[PDB]
């Protein structure tokens, strides 16, 4: 249906585990129920993901499984997305 999610903003761009981050972009979901995937640094953050608008999702980062700060959003309407920015997971 719609186009793939594209994350173009991350606030903040780094932080300790369980930091609350605001994700900005395009096609992040046509609604609250449209969101079916949210991985940051390989970590599944879907459970804490709160859809705000098609350009905004808020969630909490978790301990990394990857070393790349990739922000992958997946919607039912547009499929798996990509990000232009990365998140840096910090250690306490």
């Amino acid at each position: 249906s719609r186009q793939p999610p594209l994350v173009t903003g991350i606030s903040p761009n780094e932080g300790i585990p369980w930091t609350k981050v605001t994700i900005r972009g395009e096609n992040l979901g046509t609604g609250p129920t449209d969101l079916i995937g949210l991985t940051i640094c390989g970590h599944n953050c879907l459970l804490t993901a709160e859809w705000m608008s098609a350009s905004k999702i808020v969630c909490r980062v978790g301990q990394a499984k990857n070393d790349k700060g990739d922000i992958i959003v997946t919607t039912k309407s547009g499929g798996r997305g990509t990000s232009t920015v990365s998140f840096k997971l910090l250690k306490p």
């Binding site: 903003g9 606030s11 903040p12 232009t84």
Partner: protein
């Protein structure tokens, strides 16, 4: 493979660094309070007909940063030095930011723009246009007044800064 211009937003707290960024990035403006630590934005934009990518590092206003600023500043190619026309204090603070930037980049001619934000609040102006202009000329940089609310000159400051970074990359390559 596209050109990538790295812009950095600097200035005191509450002057509108984020508002300017979010209006430019997502065409929005909301009267909200949300102090920044460090946020990253990057998207495709068309500069003078050519598709490029702009990257924006939106930073914290609080001067609680010293060695942290150095790293951020070093990664940037151009800077938007923002202050609010309604807060003289933020204007006087620009001298410091300028100093810190020139230092790390070791370049007095680094792409730079002095931005007087919140132009829509003329009734609360504390910094005169004349004063702001004089400082900009002293530093040899352009001065532009903006409004993240009405979006006046917002696109202009980002485009002009990119053109400077662009020109700069022409000379060095």
């Amino acid at each position: 493979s596209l050109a990538l211009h790295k812009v950095i937003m600097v200035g005191s707290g509450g002057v509108g660094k984020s508002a300017l960024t979010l209006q430019f990035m997502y065409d929005e403006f909301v009267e909200d309070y949300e102090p920044t630590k460090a946020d990253s934005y990057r998207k495709k934009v068309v500069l003078d007909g050519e598709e490029v990518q702009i990257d924006i590092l939106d930073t914290a206003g609080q001067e609680d940063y010293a060695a942290i600023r150095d790293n951020y500043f070093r990664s940037g190619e151009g800077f938007l030095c923002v202050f609010s026309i309604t807060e003289m204090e933020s204007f006087a603070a620009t001298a410091d930011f300028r100093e810190q930037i020139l230092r790390v980049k070791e370049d007095e001619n680094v792409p730079f723009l002095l931005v007087g934000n919140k132009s829509d609040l003329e009734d609360k102006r504390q910094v005169s246009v004349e004063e702001a202009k004089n400082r900009a000329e002293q530093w040899n940089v352009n001065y532009v007044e903006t409004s993240a609310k009405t979006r006046a000159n917002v696109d202009k400051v980002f485009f002009d800064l990119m053109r400077e970074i662009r020109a700069r990359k022409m000379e060095d390559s």
